[PDB]
Symmetry: D2
Subunit: 353 residues, 4 copies
């Protein structure tokens, strides 16, 4: 299942009750999984191995009630939508959508179907809207040229978002590959106490990176040890309830790369590594016109959040592997789930259980 149930300890901070990004009160996650067909690749028909994942900053109208946010592009061989305004205004005003590289257009169409329905004032009595869509390429297993994600799928994922969500090869992670093993959706969280108050840092990742040899789990070179085992980009979403300004949240997003690096993420040329981070502490009203007060921790005290963020991403990445199920896709390509029995053998070998 997850790292802890296998005796694998990542970091020093304790996890949240769910040990998921939803440990941040109000955060919701929904999926729509699309699996169909088997065999030779039939460009435009299948096999289909993809889906949609939605992340909701909170339970209400994200456009009317925005949240401060930040983001960092470790390597831009990615096709994200909406980061420019996010950086300019420091806010997120729509649910966060994740899907495959060739379905971002479709995703935007679906995300808008949802947004416009919730806000009929957009484009008439008020301004436009900044849909936020990020992705990963699931071409190894999925008929990506087919663009099998439908606009209704995006609305469905949003409406399905809940506190508890499945991990592994579901939603946007359905046909993803990592370390030449089955990748996908992974999640984890951490609790930290700063000047008396307890804050939560959650992480949800869409893993689809690394060569088999790069895999590093709790410092153990499992990847190298699994060199010839059969079967032969990443979006990191960070959420926290700690009060932070948009500038600070860009700092937070950078730290996600620390957890990425520790699992063997080298950010090769073609790996779209991007991190988005937001806080639920300050809600920005779309129509506000008077001076406001933004609650924020002084930078001198947020180091714990920086570390917890690295820890969260690192385990989240590992969890996407531990939760993934073996899978076959286009052209009979197969991606086996990281072999858990062999993994335990290796962890004990390097005395780390």
């Amino acid at each position: 299942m997850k790292a802890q149930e296998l005796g694998i300890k990542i970091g020093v901070f304790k996890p949240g009750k769910r040990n998921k990004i939803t440990d941040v009160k109000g955060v919701k996650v929904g999926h729509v999984t699309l699996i169909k067909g088997k065999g030779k690749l039939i460009p435009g028909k299948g096999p289909v191995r993809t889906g949609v994942t939605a992340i909701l900053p909170h339970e209400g109208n994200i456009y009317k009630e925005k949240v401060l946010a930040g983001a960092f592009v470790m390597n831009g061989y990615s096709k994200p939508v909406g980061l420019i305004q996010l950086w300019e205004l420091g806010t997120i005003e729509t649910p966060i959508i994740l899907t495959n590289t060739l379905s971002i257009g479709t995703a935007v169409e679906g995300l808008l179907d949802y947004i416009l329905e919730e806000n009929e004032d957009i484009g008439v009595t008020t301004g436009s809207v900044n849909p936020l869509v990020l992705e990963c390429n699931d071409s190894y297993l999925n008929d990506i040229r087919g663009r099998h994600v439908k606009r209704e799928h995006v609305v469905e994922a949003i409406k399905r978002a809940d506190e508890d969500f499945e991990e592994g090869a579901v939603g946007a992670g359905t046909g993803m590959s990592a370390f030449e093993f089955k990748g996908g959706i992974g999640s984890a969280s951490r609790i930290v106490e700063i000047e008396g108050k307890k804050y939560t840092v959650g992480a949800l990742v869409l893993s689809n990176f690394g060569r088999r040899e790069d895999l590093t789990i709790a410092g153990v070179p499992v990847g190298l040890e699994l060199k010839n085992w059969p079967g032969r980009s990443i979006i990191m979403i960070i959420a926290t309830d700690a009060p932070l300004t948009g500038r600070q949240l860009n700092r937070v997003a950078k730290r996600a790369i620390v957890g990425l690096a520790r699992t063997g993420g080298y950010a090769y040329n073609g790996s779209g590594d991007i991190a988005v981070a937001f806080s639920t502490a300050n809600r920005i009203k779309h129509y506000e016109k008077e001076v406001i007060e933004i609650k924020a921790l002084p930078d001198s005290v947020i180091s714990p959040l920086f570390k917890a963020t690295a820890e969260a991403v690192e385990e989240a990445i590992i969890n996407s592997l531990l939760e993934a199920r073996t899978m076959d896709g286009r052209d009979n390509h197969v991606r086996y789930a990281l072999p858990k029995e062999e993994l335990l053998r290796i962890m004990r070998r390097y005395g780390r259980l």
Copy 2:
């Protein structure tokens, strides 16, 4: 009718043959205009006042033969698609599409339709593709909530790209507003001689910014003079044949803001001002594995290009006004074309012309 016609001098460099971005050998522009209905607004129905404009770096295959590119975001209240990879790899691998803010999704779909058709390897034997889509909000005259742009329109605009192209309220500029006058597409070019060699700098703009009183034409406060005339963001595309690296083209893109400002562009909070610059000098092969030789001017001699960029952008913005025609739209809104007759009296009144 353009600046020259009225006898208005902008800058000191001479224009190109056509005085259009297409003066840069190989560059082509195509439009698709959507006009329909009138009267009160009927969301999802009309009146319709929008379209699509496409800019092709060269007449070949853009994905297979990429061109170095740079870009600058003056104010990010914009929803551009594809800038992250552009900055990361310093290249543009698809035609450039412009349209309205709420149709970027559809634009992506339409662009992918064309791209996938031209490249069968994408998503099968090679990686994905980074569609480049920029936009401006035409809500004042257009039923933007209706998303009347269709994916076929994108493909059509591309197939229509030609050396010669219309300006004013066409393509993406169909329903645009500028200085509370009719805005839209505007273009211009300049020739510069650097160390014996002649280079061309072209600019195409999609004007949709400024208050009435902001308008500055060749230094004259035209906006203030016509403050009482009835009718009460911007994308700048820069092209050149001068050899430049991706870093240098980021610099070039910034210089376009010099021209924007001179016409009275202040980059208000809600104005999405973005500039993208590319060179036709170096062709980057998608499948290249051998060391290459990138041709580039030393930075100490490119100041003329920085200037020419500002000039073309400034005149292009003015041209979009001079080439626009009066038009009515949703809720009976109307944008008058800048009265050229009155303009002349004002110019002459300020010692100009």
Copy 3:
């Protein structure tokens, strides 16, 4: 003097009482001018035409009580000191120092002299300090290789800082050139009302850029009209405001300064170090703060007036740097003449603008 007293109107917002960056209550400016020698250049000796200019965000301890700040590099052919931390932490914790390109090291030394004197805990019980120094190249008139600026000059400039301050060829502006006329220090301010509240936007510029023919004053190509005026042969913009704004917002404000620059004929040529630094006096950040703080800040949807006021203050500030500059000779008998004001009135009149 200033554009106002000449009838030259720039922008639509009204200026502050003094029409200087110090109209932002608490802000202070001090100068140290170095002029000596004449004739042939004797590298290391003179002629000397340089100086130092200090800008204090407020009147107390800037390190212990920081101000939120932002900045934008239009063209990085510049050697600024202190911007990386400004961007990372969003704050300014030292007075702002301007001087010539090759004196930045000396400026840092002097600035630290002042700072360590005022804070004995630095380097012992607390962290270090991020000195903020910016510059322009005055080589055309100054023996820049000689590094005539002395560390004490930096401390002096800081202790001379106050509300009233001279403009033109003084302090860091002493040996600068702009549009092939004498350049230097220029300043101006604008008042704006946002949601029933008055806010001031002030600007101080160190002009040292432009070709003679680029000069644009209130839309009039004053540069071309004065093509043949004798003397033929880089810029830092400091923005201050009392409006509450976060670091991110102050980076936005910094960018708007370029609009004003462009309007006077600034094209940011290859070798022109064009940089803008913006800060607010509305939110003071205590060095040792540990409790959650409340940052006062205007919603982005209502700050466009500040963007315009910024561009305005910068545009006039640049012109004032020319109007306030007095003719000056320098190394190798090089000379830059002050923009002829009576001539300027004539040109403005010919274009029906006065």
Copy 4:
């Protein structure tokens, strides 16, 4: 000794002959170590524990013959000089100097003493010069307030620059602390073959970060294993390579340096000044060049090996800075022990290493 020879294997790429940044031919490194006094801290007097370290891109005039370069700021709690021009022009035109935070002004004076002496035209017939200076805070062991570094020390460090240089507590690393052990200069190199051609990637670090328990060596939690080990109580990474690359590409390589940092337990806490500077010796840019030049550059699609190698070089270099450091006492009788070699080899073996 260094890691490689101790038997500690980091990464999968082989190291250069010296396993130092100078394996990139032409690069040199010089130090000036200042050690004086002991006991209680007498501000401005001592004890002195600091110095200067100079890195030369090549053997000639760096100003007249510049090298292309890039840089990345992981966390800006640093006071670097020269990065703005580096990013704008993509070049380095002076030797690189490292010293303590409060000595940056002195380093500028010193570096300028050297440059102006070697370049008589600067400030007279040509432009100015961009001094490159970076730093770390050695206040725990050194009387930093005293600014004991003198301008002559800088000129000296530059002239002592050699292929063979000492590591550990020398030069700018003299008084540095890492993981609450002795820190300082560390270096390593990796050789990678790309398209039948071998390139070298070297790295020199100045370590001054991390809490005891953060220490990660070859994936082993040595930090936690030495939690209660005595002596309890930022980082600049310099990357060099002979691979041909543009400024943009070198900014990318600079970023990869953080991967190695993270893997040793670098979390970039709030007050940690973590910065990477990368340059190539492949292309020299003539100061007075006025004609179209040809930049030799490797296509991005084939540079991933350099990205991983950069990660490895930094990771091992950080470790070598610890292995080469010697125990030291300083101001206020503070002491920093060198990582216990025998105990470390013991801990490693205890984890199958």
